[PDB]
């Protein structure tokens, strides 16, 4: 009825026009058809859409968009490390994952003292710069004709080359998440 979203991934505007595409995608983790939500966080933003199921979202207390934790905004590793909790038991397989889901249908993150570790390692103001156009792939190759008009960032990619290959399932579960 409403996305489960990082309040950074709603941008500065207290008013949000968001598109609701029911059955608009497959959860990037449970592979399930779910209701997608799409919106422009702010005027400098792009159009971000939810990436995972609503359940698969509220299991690990992560945003449906950035897959970062909901309380502190750090990847699911960094929060699981400071939470000290076991490795993910949840089945990687989708037969397994859907079986776990159809079970939990028919029948730990809210009650922790605020961990100083996570608090120490988090951003004070919101990373709105995460809600912004990708980089113009034609500006990189030098072949962009769209000029300043391009809705895509006219800068070059300045990124760790082991990064920029991140996996949804791994940023949601917490295994070899390079960030």
């Amino acid at each position: 009825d409403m996305p489960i979203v990082c309040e950074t991934c709603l941008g500065p505007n207290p008013f949000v026009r968001m598109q609701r595409i029911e059955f608009g995608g497959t959860c990037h983790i449970s592979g399930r058809p779910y209701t997608v939500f799409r919106w422009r966080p702010g005027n400098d933003a792009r159009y971000k859409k939810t990436v995972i199921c609503q359940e698969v979202a509220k299991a690990k207390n992560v945003c449906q968009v950035c897959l970062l934790d909901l309380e502190y905004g750090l990847p699911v590793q960094v929060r699981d490390a400071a939470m000290g909790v076991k490795p993910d038991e949840e089945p990687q397989s989708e037969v397994g994952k859907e079986y776990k889901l159809q079970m939990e249908a028919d029948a730990s993150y809210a009650a922790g003292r605020p961990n100083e570790m996570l608090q120490k390692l988090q951003r004070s103001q919101p990373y709105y710069k995460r809600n912004q156009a990708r980089v113009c792939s034609f500006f990189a190759k030098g072949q962009c004709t769209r000029g300043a008009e391009c809705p895509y960032r006219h800068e070059l990619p300045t990124a760790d080359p082991a990064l920029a290959n991140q996996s949804y399932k791994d940023r949601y579960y917490g295994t070899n998440d390079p960030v």
Partner: protein, 45 residues
Amino acid sequence: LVLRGNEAKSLGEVRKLQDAGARKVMYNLPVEDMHAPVLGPAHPY
């Protein structure tokens, strides 16, 4: 006749509260009944 009276009365049953979870209100009560918060240590969340 003034012999002795207490303030024990007007409390008890009359103050009709709702369950700390219920998201409906079935009857129009005063603000101190229907509202007037639950209780207890903020909790951790």
